[PDB]
Amino acid sequence: SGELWPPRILVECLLPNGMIVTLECLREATLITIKHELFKEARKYPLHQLLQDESSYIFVSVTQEAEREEFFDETRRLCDLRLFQPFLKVIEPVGNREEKILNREIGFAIGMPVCEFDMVKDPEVQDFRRNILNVCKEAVDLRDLNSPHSRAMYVYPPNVESSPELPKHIYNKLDKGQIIVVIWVIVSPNNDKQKYTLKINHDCVPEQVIAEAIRKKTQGKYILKVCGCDEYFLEKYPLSQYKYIRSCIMLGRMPNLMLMAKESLYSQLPMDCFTMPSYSRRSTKSLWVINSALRIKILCATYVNVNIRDIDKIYVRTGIYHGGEPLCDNVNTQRVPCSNPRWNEWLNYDIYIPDLPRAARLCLSICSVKGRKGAKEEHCPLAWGNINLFDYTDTLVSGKMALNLWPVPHGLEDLLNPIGVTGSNPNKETPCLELEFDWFSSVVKFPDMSVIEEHANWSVLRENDKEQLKAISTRDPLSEITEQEKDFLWSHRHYCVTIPEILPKLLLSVKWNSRDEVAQMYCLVKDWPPIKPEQAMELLDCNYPDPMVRGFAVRCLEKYLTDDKLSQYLIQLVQVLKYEQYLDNLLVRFLLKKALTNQRIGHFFFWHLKSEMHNKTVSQRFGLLLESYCRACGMYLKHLNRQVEAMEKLINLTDILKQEKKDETQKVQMKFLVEQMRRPDFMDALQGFLSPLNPAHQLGNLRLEECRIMSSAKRPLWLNWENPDIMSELLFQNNEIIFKNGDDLRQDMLTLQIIRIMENIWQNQGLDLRMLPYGCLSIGDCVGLIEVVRNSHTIMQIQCKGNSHTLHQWLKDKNKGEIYDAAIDLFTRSCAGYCVATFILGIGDRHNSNIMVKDDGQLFHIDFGHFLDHERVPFVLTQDFLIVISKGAQECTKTREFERFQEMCYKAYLAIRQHANLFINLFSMMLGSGMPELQSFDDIAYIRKTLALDKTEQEALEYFMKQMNDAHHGG
């Protein structure tokens, strides 16, 4: 689709005078080259006297996606034109030259044309595009306010920790508060690499590090840099705080730093141009005065897509849902024959009109009931929808409304879908429902602060209940809440402020069906003490839809959530960007401020949003989000257009390799990819671009000597890219990456995020369970990038390259020396980590081919994309692993080394169970993501079972001991 919708290409140019000329032009010819020759050729026609000046002419044609784009960018070749039909119209240029060039970079980076966003006339989208430029301007001003240094902070942000304080176990690995490091100063234009060795403390800042280095060479214009990648140390932080240095000490290796002059870095950074776009220039009474009852009329359904013979009667099932909880009983319209869907019935609800909360959010459905067989009639949903009862401008909906109904998602059994996004199906081949709302002779507006505040305070220091209040706040969010606790919490709500962590539990105790208690709760939430960022993320879930609760949660995030924590929780924070109901929320104005301040966050903000545009439910919401980000991202639009183009030639390469060559064997496929990747079109695209998995790594000349189709499951691609950095021999010699096409990487990406979180919990607490969470990234629909972990072998393969003693003897083979006793240790502290983690998350079966071992004895899994499914213990220490752990002793179960392996697993399981609230919050935000094994709150109930959260601390361990003993057959 990139080139055309041929050995000889003929374009039928259309001159303004109307000379339809058909001429042949080369594909490599640019737009300017064909423009110059066409005018010379057009002069032979009898109507050549009417031609005007050449410079006042431009090309206009049709793109693949039907966008009539204008070709101001004469630099682009014919292949890059993305023409639909071979033809070319010449008209005088109109509009602004710079604005349309930017509109083409944004259109290509997003994947859809930007001109499509200006067709929609909905007030919700239009006033979002115009009013989202306050944050975009504010962010751009902030990063340009200070010296050129502030420009560098955006481009090369620090990769730092959340805590300067080193853990006790880590701090003992460096002696007397001092660590050694090597500096690789380059002093001459000719490559003269010299290394200086110096002793630095764990508290010194890079300014002090620079001062010591200059002394060792025998005001500063020099800044540090990680050798082998584009990471810089230009922030006034302790040197031990940086993530690279922490990794170097904890893996026990040599940190290598290089010296770069500041002026060399600043000249690399270009200027920024935020041109203000074109669209930037361009009787009511309160709701509480109404005393009627909510009545809604379902006129008819235009189309329904179920069989007449199989399905007898259909009906419409509705309900008013305040973010998951029903505000009243669901109402059924009377059943009608499938041939003629037509109800015209005034549905009546129990909700008093002033009782309505802000996020009323009526939910619809169209079920089908047969009743021929079975006592319980089988209601099978046919469609679903959602309608906000209050517009974005605090106005109750009125008058007839037409809604388009989505199809029911796969693997969903509920008649309604309260989790679905409020809106209408853009497609015009879906069931359409006609609604009518009551009209109160005026526009109904939700009350302001004054009306709500005056409702409160108008209607109208303990002994032992503090213990119960503390006990309530320490339970799981999904724990058993009883009607006696909810009564107890609400009666003692004024003493709940002294325990700020109890807010998520107290909001569950409020009844939104009444405006008396809702008004009284708004007073408390107004002056609630701030809570921890890991607990304020709980309020951003689906269960809390109120604007004040979600507004309060962001207010805590803006002050508490840091840059490194934000990067960890970026997948979830994007996922709670669909549970919001209005486009002009507070989360977007908070997420975009960070994405326009950190290029490291901005790199993943783009890719996380870009991957979810395949779904049509959030294609428009995220399209407007990326268009505003891409416009104000800066000069990163040129880098983000290199990766999108590079990752599109790969998709086309794999797609024709999957379908057209499925019958072909690997031998022909190997020679087929050799020819296809040989073409200069792929050579230019797949070279010299930043890696999507890490903005710091650069992918040099794609090395073709070892770049072959992996002979594995879904024919992946194993691609080698050299390291173009000057000092590359210290970090990476070739950045290997596996391009998985046709496999869902969203489940794997979430699994590795939990594994990253778990390892932080163990290391911080005091354990030293070392595991390998590698890099994963989903880019589009069923397409992902997987980072290769360098030297490694599957244990299935390791038994042929070297009987149960094969794994131990192989480890003892390439570990000769004193280091052998440390290779088994690392094989133990990594075995224990992946046994607790797999058991808790319930990852799928673990063969001897999903298990990877490094030359140093480290162990890690190729995490399957099927978690919480296989109660079940996936990883059991086989007879191969038990020999290595017990130092080769035949009495594996009773040795001291295996005893220390059990007490290592027990301390790990107890540590995670103490931080079980964090893992429950993370799993509860990906409900609307669409993973088949995580779509409802009953799926997270598996986590609460394997962690034994219901039982006590001592009852939980005997649940773990028995569960492992069912396969290990011995303690």
Binding site: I20, I311, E378, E480
Partner: protein, 265 residues
């Protein structure tokens, strides 16, 4: 007499998880209820779950020195005595906001009558037959869903190409209108060959768009028709899943372990 054994009562379901009881009270009449052992797994709790107002409530039954009740006055002696008192008297005395009493108890004896062939000889064989039917139907539905997704991508792709052909016609028609204005200077007194080619190209493009319009119409019908088959298969998959799990739930209490089910599934 007024206090029977909880074991023989129909509403008391024993020990079931919260997720296993939400399905029982799913889309049910308001006022239905059942009593289950508390999730915390002590002795004598017997939390009561009730469906009122469209959502599932929970009520804990306190127990101290051999009595039972909701609040601290533990007047009622046994659990069966307490429930039978609130079936004939609304819960409004306990709480003004709780109105509907325990109208329709969820019973396990009726579900026992639902199961055929209590003898073990037929339970084992019938489970295999139902699982084979369920697995075959599930494979059929997964094939239809994959096909239905594929046709969704084709009509979306074909629809966009229709939009492009509409715009190309507009550009060519707009270019033709310029010729009508520009040909006035010549007709009042080559051009004829040029005009014929432009008319020929537009006519062919009109046919090309029309063929695309017809092809989309045929593809749209297949997209709709298969969506009818997919919607009809699902209810049958629903009924088979209930009965297959019912036999497995009845068979799993004969002394087998979960590891057998994991390997079998």
């Amino acid at each position: 007499n007024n206090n029977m054994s909880l074991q023989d009562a129909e509403w008391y379901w024993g020990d079931i998880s919260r997720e296993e009881v939400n399905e029982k009270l799913r889309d049910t009449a308001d006022g239905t209820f059942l009593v289950r052992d508390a999730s915390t797994k002590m002795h004598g709790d017997y939390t009561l779950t009730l469906r009122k107002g469209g959502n599932n409530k929970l009520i804990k039954i306190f127990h101290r020195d051999g009595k039972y009740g909701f609040s601290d006055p533990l007047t009622f002696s046994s659990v069966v005595e307490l429930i039978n008192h609130y079936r004939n008297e609304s819960l409004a005395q306990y709480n003004p906001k709780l109105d509907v009493k325990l109208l329709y108890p969820v019973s396990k004896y009726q579900q026992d009558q639902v199961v055929k062939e209590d003898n073990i000889e037929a339970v084992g064989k019938k489970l295999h037959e139902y699982n084979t039917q369920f697995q075959e139907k599930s494979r059929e539905y997964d094939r239809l869903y994959e096909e239905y997704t594929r046709t969704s991508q084709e009509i979306q792709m074909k629809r966009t190409a229709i939009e492009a052909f509409n715009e190309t016609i507009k550009i060519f028609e707009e270019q033709c209108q310029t010729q009508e204005r520009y040909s006035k200077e010549y007709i009042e007194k080559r051009i004829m060959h040029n005009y014929d080619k432009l008319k020929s190209r537009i006519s062919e493009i009109i046919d090309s768009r029309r063929r695309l319009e017809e092809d989309l119409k045929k593809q749209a019908a297949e997209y709709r028709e298969i969506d009818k088959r997919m919607n009809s298969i699902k209810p049958d998959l629903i009924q088979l899943r209930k009965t297959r799990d019912q036999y497995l739930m009845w068979l799993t209490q004969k002394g087998v372990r979960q590891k057998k089910l994991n390997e079998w599934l």
